[PDB]
Amino acid sequence: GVLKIVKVYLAVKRRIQPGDKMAGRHGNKGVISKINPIEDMPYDENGTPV
Amino acid sequence: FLKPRLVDIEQVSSTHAKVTLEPLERGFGHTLGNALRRILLSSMPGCAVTEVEIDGVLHEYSTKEGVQEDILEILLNLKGLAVRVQGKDEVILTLNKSGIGPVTAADITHDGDVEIVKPQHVICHLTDENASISMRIKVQRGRGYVPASTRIRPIGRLLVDACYSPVERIAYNVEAARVEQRTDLDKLVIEMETNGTIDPEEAIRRAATILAEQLEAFVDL
Amino acid sequence: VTEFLKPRLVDIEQVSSTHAKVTLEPLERGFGHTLGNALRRILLSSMPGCAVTEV
């Protein structure tokens, strides 16, 4: 009972935002809380922000 | 209060160079250090690409023939193209590579003003002498990070993410310089790590300029 | 490229002449801290001012 089927493939680009569930491998499940500006991130002596 | 002044811009490399201020009063060392580091990492005029136009590719998830890399990660490479402008605020760069061989950034048909600083930054690997990539790369100014979506049109346009952040790693390290005869003049250094598109001296100049301008919110001139 | 929003002492709701509360208009993110911490270091660190030192 169907003549011709058209299938359309949307391809979104989802990235990190405050609320995406995200975990390490050792069952340390967490959720993103705030996309912290790179300056706010604590930096070590060399200045590489974690 | 002795004022700080630029005394060394030692160009340890083209990618990064430390900038040192000879005098700084007790306490102001870490103050100026943190202020400069924060204002540099946050806001510095960048030049990263904003819009590419492949020749025969419609959407960014297509795969041109001949290129050893799909278009998406070609864009991913492009968003870190270390380029700088001098006279314009937006420019469209044309690329026409042909024949087998990686497409180094030097292949970009640059002008006298827009000059790339990493002519070895590979974009894509052409794997056929009868295949030729052709890109109309649009390069703009700006500051901070601007994604593809939050910037308010034809099919061929591929809205790449924006990364207007010439600096990649800033780290100040106060020291102790025995200036004249007064001790406690903590010499300050800035082990900044740009992407080769901003002069470290001029970087510090503009960062201090914006710090003063925003600090002039509550003070007279 | 260099246009940055600047507040003008938007709220200066001083409670008593020995305790005020200055609240600026929105500033670009990463600048509220870079100004608050800078002024905090300046103020808790060094200003001209007389005080007792010994007796």
Swiss-Prot record, chain A:
PTM annotation, UniProt: Acetylated on several lysine residues in the presence of glucose.
Biotech use, per record: Co-administration of salinamide and rifampicin or salinamide and myxopyronin suppresses the emergence of resistance to both antibiotics.
Signal peptide bounds: none
Family classification: Belongs to the RNA polymerase beta chain family.
Subunit organization: The RNAP catalytic core consists of 2 alpha, 1 beta, 1 beta' and 1 omega subunit. When a sigma factor is associated with the core the holoenzyme is formed, which can initiate transcription. The rRNA transcription and antitermination complex (rrnTAC) consists of RNAP, NusA, NusB, NusE (rpsJ), NusG, SubB, ribosomal protein S4, DNA and precursor rRNA; S4 is more flexible than other subunits. In pull-down experiments interacts with CedA. (Microbial infection) Interacts (via flap domain) with Escherichia phage lambda antitermination protein Q; this interaction renders bacterial RNAP resistant to transcription pausing and allows it to read through termination signals.
Role noted for this protein: DNA-dependent RNA polymerase (RNAP) catalyzes the transcription of DNA into RNA using the four ribonucleoside triphosphates as substrates.
Protein's name according to its UniProt entry: DNA-directed RNA polymerase subunit beta
Species, as recorded: Escherichia coli (strain K12)
UniProt lineage: Bacteria, Pseudomonadati, Pseudomonadota, Gammaproteobacteria, Enterobacterales
Gene that this sequence comes from: rpoB
